[PDB]
Structure formats: C-alpha cells, structure tokens
Amino acid sequence: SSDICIVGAGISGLTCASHLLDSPACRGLSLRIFDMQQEAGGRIRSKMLDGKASIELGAGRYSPQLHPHFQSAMQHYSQKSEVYPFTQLKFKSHVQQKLKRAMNELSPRLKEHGKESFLQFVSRYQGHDSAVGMIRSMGYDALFLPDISAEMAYDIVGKHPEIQSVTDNDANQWFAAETGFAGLIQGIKAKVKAAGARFSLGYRLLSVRTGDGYLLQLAGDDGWKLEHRTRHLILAIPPSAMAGLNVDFPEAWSGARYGSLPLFKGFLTYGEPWWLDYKLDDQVLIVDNPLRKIYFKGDKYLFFYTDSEMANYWRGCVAEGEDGYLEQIRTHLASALGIVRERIPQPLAHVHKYWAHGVEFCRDSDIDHPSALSHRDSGIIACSDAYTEHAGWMEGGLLSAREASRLLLQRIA
Amino acid sequence: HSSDICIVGAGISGLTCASHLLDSPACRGLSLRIFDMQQEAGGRIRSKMSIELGAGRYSPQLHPHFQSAMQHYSQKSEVYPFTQLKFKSHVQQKLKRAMNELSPRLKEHGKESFLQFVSRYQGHDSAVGMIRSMGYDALFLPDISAEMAYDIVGKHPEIQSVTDNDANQWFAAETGFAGLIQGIKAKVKAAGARFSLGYRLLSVRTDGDGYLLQLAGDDGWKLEHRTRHLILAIPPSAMAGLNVDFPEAWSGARYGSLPLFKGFLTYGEPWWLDYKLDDQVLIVDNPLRKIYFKGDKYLFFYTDSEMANYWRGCVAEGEDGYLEQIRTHLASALGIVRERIPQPLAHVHKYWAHGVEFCRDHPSALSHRDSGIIACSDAYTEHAGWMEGGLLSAREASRLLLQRI
Ligand SMILES: Cc1cc2nc3c(=O)[nH]c(=O)nc-3n(C[C@H](O)[C@H](O)[C@H](O)COP(=O)(O)OP(=O)(O)OC[C@H]3O[C@@H](n4cnc5c(N)ncnc54)[C@H](O)[C@@H]3O)c2cc1C
Ligand SMILES: Cc1cc2nc3c(=O)[nH]c(=O)nc-3n(C[C@H](O)[C@H](O)[C@H](O)COP(=O)(O)OP(=O)(O)OC[C@H]3O[C@@H](n4cnc5c(N)ncnc54)[C@H](O)[C@@H]3O)c2cc1C
C-alpha cells in the first residue's frame, strides 16, 4: 500500500517523484513507483557497444537553447556533456542546397494553407514528385505523414539538429551525455530512493479501479500477480500505453487526439574507421535510401536513425535475420557514398532497437492542451511529453512532470 | 518468413528436436526455423556465473539420455554432493522404515493423494510431520498421488535413500548446464537452423497445406510465419494459452503445474564450515525448506509450490525484508542466534511460476488429431520435471515428424 503511486519510471515519472518528495505537503506520504521494465528510463536507453562506446538506443541529444529544464537537470545531477557534432550537412545534395530558399519561399503560404499536411502543402506549389524529392531530403519520414501539418513540419525542421539551418536556427547548440543519459535517470532515481520512494521494477499495470482511493492490478514479468492500493495515482506513461488500461482514454481525459510513429536506430562498429578517409568523421549524411540519416561518430562507430515507415522497414529486415539486415545496410552505405559495395567493410559488432511508439504527440488542434491531464471522475493524473509542445523531447517530460506534480499537490488539497 | 519445419521452444526439448531432424538424411537442405519468446535459449535451464537458477543436477542411472548428451558435447561434470541428510531430525531418521511399511499398501490405495494415503494409516498430524520433512511441498498436493509421490522421492537426490536408492549418483555441470544448451545450439546452427529469439507465438491456423503462425516480438513487432511442419516444444501451460484446443484435442489427460523458487547467497567468508555444513543439505519445516551449502563457495535454498509463492511475495515486498527473512530462517534451521549469520555480499533468485509440469495420470510426444501439429515437453513423459524427460519427448517428437515428412 502507498499514499502516492507513480506508474512509469521514465524521466517523466521519476521527475514527478522528485518534485513531490521535494514538497512539504508530501512529508509522511509513502510513494511507490512501478515500471514494466527491469530498469528505469523508458525511452532513454543507454548502452555499451561491445565494450567500445556508450551509445543511445533512445533519446540522444539536447539543446540548451530549446531544452533549458533538461540542461538545468544535467547540471543539477552532475552529468558530463559533450558536443553533439551532427548539426549541419557537410555533403549536401543539390536538392539539399536548395532547401533553405525553397522552404523560405513557401513560408508565407503557411498563412493560407499551413494546416494541411506538409506533403500536400509542398505539392500544392511544386507538384508531387518535386515535393517528394524535397521533403525526403530532410531525412525524417514523419514529414510525409497525413497528420503532420505544414506548420508542424516547419516547427520539426527548426528543432532537429541535422536540419535546423534550413529554417535558420544554426545558433542552437547541441550536446550529448558523455556516459549516456541513463546516468541522469540513475541520478534522479538515487535521489528519490534516498528520499524514501520505493521501486517495484518489472511490473506491468493491467488495470485500475477506484473506493476512497485506488486498487491497481499488476503483473510481474515472471508471472507474479500483485494488487496495490494507493490514495493518489499518476500514470507517467505515454498515450499509447494509457489506451491499453481500462480508464477510458482519451475521451474521459481531454478528448484530444494523439498521434504516434515508430523509430529505429542501428549502431555498427568496424575493425577500421574507414569513413575517416572520406572526411565523414563527426558528420551526418541524409540520403534517400532506407538508411535515411547516417551518422559517423569520430572514429568509433557509425549509426543510422529512421522513423515512420523506414523504421518498420528496418524492423522487418531484422525479423528476417541478422545476415540480410547487415547486407542491406552495407548495400545502402555503398549507394550513399557512391562507392562500390566491396569497398564497404563488414561490421564487427552491432546493436539496434525498434520503438513501436518512439514519438507520441498531440494532434493539431484549436483547443489548448494542458501539460498534464487528470481524469474527469477519478482524479487520476496523466503525465507525458506527448502532452506538451516539446512532444518527442525529454524536455516535454520535465514540463509535464512539473504540471502533474503541481496537480497532485493540489488534489492533496 | 517461412520454413519447412518450425520449432517453437528453444529449451532442451526444442533444441534436441532440431538436432534429431537436422541429423536425418530426410531433412537434408530443408529450411528450419526455431522461435522462442526469450532472448536466449535454454528455457528452464538457466546458468549464471557458476549457479543454476533452473535445472541443476542429473544422475547417470536415472538420466542415461542426459548423460549421453553431456558426454557427446564434451561437457564436464562435478559431484553433486547433496545426496544424503547428514543432520537428520528424529522424523527424518524414521522415514525409510515408515515408507517401507506403507509401500505394500500402494496397490490398495496408491491412487489416493499422498497426503490422504499417509493420513489413512498414520493420522493427519503424523502424516503432515512426516511428509513435510521430505522437503518437497509438491507432496502435499491433491494432484500428487501416493504412487507418484514414491516415484518423486526415489528420483530426487536429497531423499532417494528413503526408498533404497542411495546407489544412484548425481552430478552437476562444472561450467553450468547452459554450456550444454550452447553446444546443442551451435551444432543445430552449424547445420543451418535459423533462430528467432524474442518472439512469442500467439496463435496458429492450418492455412491449407501448412500452418500460419502469428507471433509478437518483445518490442511489439508483429510477425506472421508460414511452415509445413510444426513442433510446439513448450510446456502444457503454454499450449493452453494458444488457440489449439489443448489438452482436449490432444491426449485428453489433464496436466498439473507448480511453482519453484531458488535463492543464492554469497558471503565474505564461508561461515557455515564451522558447523561442518560444507557440501551438506538440511531439510527443515521452516519456509527455506531445503538449504544447501556448496563447498566453501555459497549457499542456496530451493522451494516449491506454496513456499515458492511465499518467497516470491517476499521479493515483491522488497529486498531488505526478503534478506532479513532468509537470515531469520537460516538461524532457526541451525538453532543459533540471528547475529551469528552474517549479511551476504551478494545474492540472486529466480521464481518459476510453472517450474514443474506433469500429467495427472501417454505417448512421449503428442499430436493434434486434425491438424498434425506436434507437441513436445518433459511433461508428457515418465521423467516429467527432469531434462531427461525433455530428451525423450524430443526423440519421439522427431520420430513423429519424420513420419509426417
Ligand atoms: C529513438 C528515439 C530517439 C529519441 N531522441 C531524442 C533526443 O535526441 N532528444 C530528446 O530530447 N528526446 C528524444 N527522444 C524522446 C524521449 O525519449 C522522450 O520524450 C522521453 O524519454 C519520454 O519520457 P516519459 O517518461 O514521458 O515516457 P517514457 O520514457 O516512454 O517512459 C514511460 C514508462 O512507462 C512504462 N510503462 C508504460 N505502460 C506501462 C504499464 N502499463 N505498466 C507499467 N509501466 C508502464 C514504460 O516501461 C516506460 O519506462 C527519443 C525517443 C526515441 C524513441
Ligand atoms: C527450479 C528448477 C530446478 C530444476 N532442476 C532440475 C534438475 O536438477 N534436473 C533436471 O533434470 N531437471 C530440472 N528441472 C527441469 C528442467 O529444467 C526441465 O525439465 C527442462 O528444462 C524442460 O525443457 P523443455 O525444453 O521441455 O521446456 P522449457 O525448458 O520449459 O522450454 C520451453 C521454452 O518455450 C518457450 N515458450 C513457451 N511458450 C512460448 C510461446 N508461446 N512462444 C514462444 N516461445 C515459448 C519458453 O520461452 C522456453 O524457452 C528444473 C526446473 C526448475 C524450474
């Protein structure tokens, strides 16, 4: 039993625990934190690649100009930052060199047609084939989706490091975590455990019922069933996960609608840093082939990152088998570089991760969305980056946690 | 995503089926796919560096097929010492005699539960005290008949002496039974088996000739796989989750299961040497139930059925309480003060919600009347609860599938 239960130990849930435990109104309230995974962190998943480097299977970068709360958290918990180098395109295609003017040329038309999908918007002025080639040249297949408006696309482009110069946001600086953002998740976790929160990792919330308070049915990843009673409940899970529980989401919560799209990253190490030769170190290529964005980190490893249908494409390759997945990568590396396949070596060790719901966000609405939500009848609070204007970014988790904890403090009344 | 032959389950049964099939001239060049919901093969064999969180011992006398696998794959063995009770309670001293006296009555009343059967002749309280001192709470289950209980006692090393089977010898794997799983795996792979670990079978349908399997990856990825021949090398509990009308359309026997739990602890010093406990096992009434001290390396305990659940509930309530309970029950087992039991340096545990599965009582593998699907598990065998049973089921499941080809 607890007074306060948080389900979700991503950055959102852990940060809620932190604000709550920082407050005098929470003195003497026991706090329980569940997560279905065996480690805290959610979409922040740092990993050692074959003992050679720390890589980010999930969130990988931030900007102090866009993400001031996150920057403040990194400093607070004493995490070392290094420069994220992938902030420009050193090897632009001809289409990519036209991007800035092309985009600038269309911007005033956002007034009249900015609510339609970016693909239709661009197509309205350039026709289909040219719109396709231009949009594809920015490397985020999200920009092809029907539920990404032209206004949303301009926003997206200005906030991603590889293409921020297209909308003239080159001033924004970007950083990564020298030892992984998991170190921040560990630092928050250590702080909340030190203040008395109790962690139950490995349990998946299946359903919730109200009488004075709440009764939760959870299942352990080894089969162990658990029931837990709390007086106050924050579900620090994304919209997709909310939809799996029996709490009538979103009708009973906001009635807003939430989009979702998958993500994929693959990291590969090589015997020789063969890309040094071509001056690719610390650079990113954005290409039309299914690798889409190819990043070469120093002389240590390379990786690629894709979304939406290309993420599903890569996951399907993996399902067929390692060998064909690796060979497909080699074929697309050779095409991207314009050199012959046998000149791309075979990798030494690699890792990959597919996120079925890597990004979740509020769909374009005329209703303002609050940063955290509560259930009409039950007073259950819902916390996620998806509910903020930084949907898709750790910053939106911090923003949502601030509001969720504020709301819980006010319910505690 | 298709195969000629698909095996779901990469425990020792599934891997051994793949082994048999890939050895047969009839499967030369056929495409063979093996799925498992976990990210590593092995199932209920799980080694950690070296302790056994799952299966931990075998006997050459009881498990000749197992001994032959260990031999064929050059896996080394070490004496498993926990083969007699050095510190018998008064009740434990009486067990061999009392079990000898009851045994003639199995022919009359041996189909009753072991508890009923012993109560019948000794009374409830006496039966409880006796049955308890054998250390397997499976022996209290209405599902476990007197005749099955005697089979159980004769097969388990810590109490085999009780039915005149001290002669049976026991060994563990010197590098863990996972090295055996890794050997079978590397061999089926070299022969061209393809693995898809991390996928859970949800359902199957018989699309024309063949079968269409629906699977979910552990990251959510949904996958459909077509095959021409199918072995489900999963236990009955898992078969029941599928859409294949198990057990009715197969055997029509009924199947039992019970949970298991093991906890392992290490210490700055092997403190138990003071009590001459190295390489000895104690069976106690308290919740630890069977407590083993392994040379001067570590100790562990091993429980089943409702004491397995007790320990899983403890773990769920938190580490401190769990570690404290263990410390409390170790002192009572030894009859010494709590403070004489140091705090561990490290520990690990594992709960198996379906640790043992068995037929309530049968061929060694099954097949579905209508669909031709084959089912393979130690549960369908005379060695349910043992890796040997898995090897026997795989022989038969392989034989059935070769027939089908
Ligand atoms: C590939 C990828 C790259 C990214 N890159 C960046 C980047 O460069 N910069 C950046 O700022 N952001 C990035 N992000 C986004 C960032 O990861 C998210 O914005 C943030 O991590 C979300 O935190 P959260 O705590 O709201 O949700 P999550 O991190 O999703 O955590 C929710 C938690 O709830 C748990 N859960 C869900 N349902 C249940 C249930 N029923 N019971 C129990 N537990 C449950 C999950 O296990 C999870 O731990 C990236 C994301 C991905 C996927
Ligand atoms: C605690 C413990 C101690 C033991 N000690 C001993 C011992 O000392 N000696 C001994 O001989 N035996 C022992 N055993 C028994 C031995 O572990 C088993 O008899 C044997 O390993 C069973 O092998 P199997 O391949 O038939 O089934 P499992 O090992 O249970 O393999 C079944 C596999 O199927 C997979 N699976 C299930 N459902 C699905 C699905 N829907 N989709 C995909 N995959 C699926 C599982 O992930 C698993 O890998 C012990 C067992 C336990 C639990």
Q: Is B240 on the interface with A (CB under 8 A)?
A: no
Inter-chain CB proximity A356 and B220 less than 8 Å: yes
Chain A residues within an 8 Å CB radius of B1: 319-320
CB pairs under 8 A between A and B: 36
- Which atom of ligand 2 is nearest the CA belonging to B384? 19
CA distance A258 to B128: 60
Alpha helices in A258-388 (DSSP H): 309-320, 322-337
Determine if the peptide bond prior to B60 is cis (ω within 30°): no
Q: Nearest CA to B261 among B133, B330, B355? A: B355
Residue B308 — left, alpha, or beta (φ > 0 → left; ψ -120 to 50 → alpha)? alpha
- Report phi then psi at A250, rounded to 5: -95, -5
3-state secondary structure of B171: strand
Q: How far is B31 from chain A (nearest CA, A)?
A: 13
Q: Nearest CA to A7 among A241, A173, A285? A: A241
Q: How far is A218 from chain B (nearest CA, A)?
A: 11
Identify residue A261 by its one-letter amino acid code: L
On whether the CB atoms of residues B113 and B141 are closer than 8 A, the answer is yes
**Pick from B223, B353, B354: CB nearest A319:** B223
CA distance B66 to B173: 12
Q: Nearest CA to B340 among B332, B352, B348? A: B332
Beta bridge partners, A283, equal A296
Query: Within 10 A of B333 (CB to CB), how many other CB atoms are there?
Result: 20
Ligand (nearest to CA of A384): 1
On whether the CB atoms of residues B295 and B278 are closer than 8 A, the answer is yes
CA distance A325 to B196: 14
Chain B residues within an 8 Å CB radius of A200: 316
On whether the CB atoms of residues A344 and A333 are closer than 8 A, the answer is yes
**Pick from A224, A321, A356: CB nearest B312:** A224
Chain A residues within an 8 Å CB radius of B220: 354, 356-357
Beta bridge partners, B376, equal B365
Chain B residues within an 8 Å CB radius of A322: none
Element of type H or E holding A381: strand A381-383
**Does ligand 1 have an atom closer than 6 angstroms to the CB of A266?**
no
A182-A186-A187-A188 Cα dihedral, nearest 10 degrees? 100
Contacts of B64 (CB under 8 A, 6+ apart): B388
Q: How far is A263 from chain B (nearest CA, A)?
A: 12
On whether the CB atoms of residues B169 and B95 are closer than 8 A, the answer is no
Chain A residues within an 8 Å CB radius of B354: 223
Identify residue A242 by its one-letter amino acid code: M
**Does ligand 2 have an atom closer than 6 angstroms to the CB of B238?**
yes
Residues 82-121 of B with CB under 8 A from A: none
- Best of B32, B35, B221 to mutate (most A CBs within 10 Å, chain A): B221
B73: which DSSP letter? Answer: T
| HSE-up (13 A, CA, CB side) for residue A218 | 26
- Which atom of ligand 1 is nearest the CA belonging to A385? 26
Q: How far is B300 from chain A (nearest CA, A)?
A: 20
Give the pair of three-digit tokens for residue A277. Answer: 């030769």
CA distance B258 to B263: 17
A139: which DSSP letter? Answer: S
Give the pair of three-digit tokens for residue B301. Answer: 């305990």
On whether the CB atoms of residues B399 and B23 are closer than 8 A, the answer is no
Q: Is B318 on the interface with A (CB under 8 A)?
A: yes
- Gyration radius of chain A over CA positions: 22
Inter-chain CB proximity A220 and B316 less than 8 Å: yes
Is there a binding annotation on residue B123? no
Query: Within 10 A of B114 (CB to CB), how many other CB atoms are there?
Result: 27
Residues 10-49 of A with CB under 8 A from B: none
Inter-chain CB proximity B318 and A198 less than 8 Å: yes
What is the secondary structure of B76-127 as a DSSP string? -EEE---SSBTT--HHHHTHHHHHHHHGGGHHHHTTSBHHHHHHHHH-HHHH
CA distance A320 to A162: 31
Query: What number of residues does chain B have?
Result: 405
Q: Nearest CA to A222 among B35, B137, B44, B306? A: B44
From A56, A206, A237, A312, mutation site for ligand 1 pocket: most ligand atoms within 8 A of C-beta: A237
Inter-chain CB proximity B219 and A319 less than 8 Å: no
| Helix, strand, coil content of chain A in percent (nearest 5) | 35, 25, 40
Q: Annotated binding residues of A for Mg(2+), as ranges? A: 10, 13, 236
CA-proximal residue: ligand 2, atom 20 (nearest): B387
Q: How far is A222 from chain B (nearest CA, A)?
A: 7
On whether the CB atoms of residues B10 and B34 are closer than 8 A, the answer is yes
Residue with tokens 């018998």: B88
On whether the CB atoms of residues B377 and B235 are closer than 8 A, the answer is yes
Give the pair of three-digit tokens for residue B276. Answer: 């001459």
CA-proximal residue: ligand 1, atom 20 (nearest): A394
B158: which DSSP letter? Answer: T
Question: Would you say the C-alpha torsion A201, A202, A208, A211 has a positive or negative sign?
Answer: negative
CA distance B194 to B196: 7
Chain A residues within an 8 Å CB radius of B221: 315-316, 319, 354, 356
Chain B residue with the nearest C-alpha to that of A317: B1
Q: Is A319 on the interface with B (CB under 8 A)?
A: yes
Q: Residue B184: is it exposed, middle or buried by C-beta count within 10 angstroms (0-12/13-18/19+)?
A: buried
**Does ligand 1 have an atom closer than 6 angstroms to the CB of A159?**
no
3-state secondary structure of A354: strand
Identify residue B154 by its one-letter amino acid code: G
Chain B residue with the nearest C-alpha to that of A227: B316
**Does ligand 1 have an atom closer than 6 angstroms to the CB of A35?**
yes
CA-proximal residue: ligand 2, atom 10 (nearest): B386
Inter-chain CB proximity B217 and A319 less than 8 Å: yes
Across B318-390, the runs of DSSP E, i.e. the strands, are: 346-359, 365-367, 374-376
On whether the CB atoms of residues B265 and B281 are closer than 8 A, the answer is no
Distance B18 CA to ligand 1 centre (A): 39
Q: Is B196 on the interface with A (CB under 8 A)?
A: yes
Q: Nearest CA to B205 among B370, B68, B21, B400? A: B370
CA distance B282 to B88: 8
Contacts of A342 (CB under 8 A, 6+ apart): none
What is the secondary structure of A60-121 as a DSSP string? --B-TTT-HHHHHHHHHTTPPEEE---SS-SS--HHHHTHHHHHHHHGGGHHHHTTSBHHHH
Q: Is B80 on the interface with A (CB under 8 A)?
A: no
Q: What is the resolution of this structure in A?
A: 2.2
Chain B residues within an 8 Å CB radius of A320: 1
Q: How far is B315 from chain A (nearest CA, A)?
A: 10
What is the secondary structure of A211-265 as a DSSP string? --SEEEEEEETTS-EEEEEEEEEEE-S-HHHHHTSSS-TTTTTT---EEEEEEEE
Burial annotation B220-259 (CB, 10 A radius, 16+ → b, else e):
ebebebebbbbbbbbbbbbbeebebebbeebbeeebbbbb
A8-A14-A17-A18 Cα dihedral, nearest 10 degrees? -170
3-state secondary structure of A15: helix
On whether the CB atoms of residues A137 and A97 are closer than 8 A, the answer is no
Chain A residues within an 8 Å CB radius of B350: 222
Inter-chain CB proximity A354 and B221 less than 8 Å: yes
Quick one: how far is CA A335 from the chain centroid?
A: 28
